[PDB]
């Protein structure tokens, strides 16, 4: 009947051709419009084999978001493979619009509607669509924003839990607000605010689920070990101006009987960064007197397990990120491309 295949998909979006927004601009070409009648076809009682970590769709979306950024975000100068280039860096509007991924005639996407499913193995409630759903290409570190949500319980995805060089995606069944502000009247100084009471509820249940995977083992959160500020800081984006957030106050082992509320963590803009599109560094300009502000939905955490838990009785976990494919893996887990007649 049907068969696993790696075809070339196309993108669909509810873009607007008039708006000069980078996302609308890039999605006005490369994408087609958008299906107003997306046909979902419940596969009777079939059972299929998914694997979110060997999914070609992630590589195709990776390429798309790559080509979105380094063709529509203007870098003052980029330094990479033994070369330096010059360009103009005009400031732009920036808001990620949902992108649907679509199979050409001769192919369909199988979809998993298993309420609690960790992107590997059997599915059971197999469905079939000719296009994925509204997936905002939100590029972030340590925290996934404006993404999907686990229908029922918190889910824990990892290609191999015993391999601690693999990233852990934790998929929340509860959205969390994150208000990040770059006021008017220091220039580069931003701050971020998150309902501490609400937030600590989520974390408590996240540690409880993580404990479920680890035979009742004491769960510890520690700030990231070392490396490029892009992974040690929750580094996301706002109105084209890259923020960098210190999440140490966030993963607070104490605040788990009294504690408090409004958690306020530092965060700051950067003009030089490390491109995620390739190994290299990138020059950019500062803002201009605007009250730069984004609210975002926390929908998951990028985590890393240590390797001194062969002893003790406590497993430590550190904020992660940097592998941007993983962001795309957190939304493309329930899909896989299949070839029919």
């Amino acid at each position, epitope marked *: 009947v049907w068969k696993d295949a790696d075809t070339t998909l196309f993108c669909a979006s509810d873009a607007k051709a008039h708006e000069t927004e980078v996302h609308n601009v890039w999605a006005t070409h490369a994408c087609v419009p958008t299906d107003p009648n997306p046909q979902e076809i419940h596969l009777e009682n079939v059972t299929e084999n998914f694997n979110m970590w060997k999914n070609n769709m992630v590589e195709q979306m990776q390429e798309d978001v790559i080509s979105l950024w380094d063709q529509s975000l203007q870098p003052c100068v980029k330094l990479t493979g033994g070369s330096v280039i010059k360009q103009a860096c005009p400031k732009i509007s920036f808001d990620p619009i949902p992108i649907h991924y679509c199979t050409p*005639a*001769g192919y369909v996407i199988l979809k998993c509607n298993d309420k609690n499913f960790n992107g590997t193995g059997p599915c059971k409630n197999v469905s079939s669509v000719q296009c994925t759903h509204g997936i905002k290409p939100v590029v972030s570190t340590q925290l996934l924003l404006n993404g999907s949500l686990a229908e029922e319980e918190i889910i824990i995805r990892s290609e191999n839990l015993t391999n601690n060089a693999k990233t852990i995606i934790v998929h929340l069944n509860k959205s969390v607000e994150i208000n990040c502000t770059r006021p008017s009247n220091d220039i580069r100084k931003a701050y971020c605010e998150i309902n501490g009471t609400k937030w600590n509820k989520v974390l408590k249940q996240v540690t409880e689920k993580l404990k479920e995977h680890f035979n009742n083992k004491t769960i510890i959160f520690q700030p990231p070990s070392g490396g490029d500020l892009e992974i040690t800081m929750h580094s996301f984006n706002c109105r084209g101006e890259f923020f960098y957030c210190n999440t140490t106050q966030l993963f607070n082992n104490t605040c788990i009987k009294g504690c408090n509320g409004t958690i306020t963590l530092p965060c700051k803009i950067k003009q030089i960064i490390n491109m995620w599109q390739g190994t290299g560094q990138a020059m950019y300009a500062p803002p201009i007197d605007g009250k730069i502000n984004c609210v975002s939905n926390i929908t998951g955490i990028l985590l890393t397990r240590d390797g001194g838990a062969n002893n003790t009785s406590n497993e430590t976990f550190r904020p992660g990120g940097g592998n941007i494919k993983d962001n795309w893996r957190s939304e493309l887990y329930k899909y896989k491309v299949v070839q029919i007649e």
Partner: antibody
Amino acid sequence: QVQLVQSGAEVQKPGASVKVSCKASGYTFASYDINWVRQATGQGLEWMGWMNPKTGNTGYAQKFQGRVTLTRNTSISTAYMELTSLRSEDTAVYYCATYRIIAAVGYRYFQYWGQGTLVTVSS
Amino acid sequence: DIQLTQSPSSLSASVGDSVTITCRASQGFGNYLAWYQQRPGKVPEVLIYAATTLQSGVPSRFSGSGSGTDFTLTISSLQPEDVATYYCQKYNSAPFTFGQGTRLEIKR
């Protein structure tokens, strides 16, 4: 097997509304959408709109939305079509059509067409 | 987005000749393109779907080819029966846009 039967040919006056019908058979009228296409005087085909029987949500081409209204009666397996504020320009043949009968996605090409309904807009 | 441009809008060949109709799109749309023959005062009859795939019950002298934004219906050994009008349509989703059509007459 599968069959689509429209209403009888009609006549209306410059702005009057017209309600064409389309009684399907040979398939479970639930699962498959119903599409409306029209052919004017010495012109080509022009897709008008799509209608879903299971939901009742409808979409139209920009040239027609505001004037076309598609409804449905699941019990008689009959899709309806309704045009308002007509012109000498709207004198045309109206077909209903529907996709090939299959479970899989990607088969939304019109295999089954109606016999067509001529609608003369004239005083 | 998504504009289909069908050419020519008129064609004249003789029985046994080989004719070629062309459809050209703005952007790609995953080859959800069907070819219809509407015979003089008849109903449309989908000859070709999925860009290149032949619909059973129609002769094999009708073929579709091309991909992305360049498609072509070729009628290899033309016959008198084929005197009709041919349209290309997209069916990835709404709006299932039609081409402008191609009247085909026969020299004899």
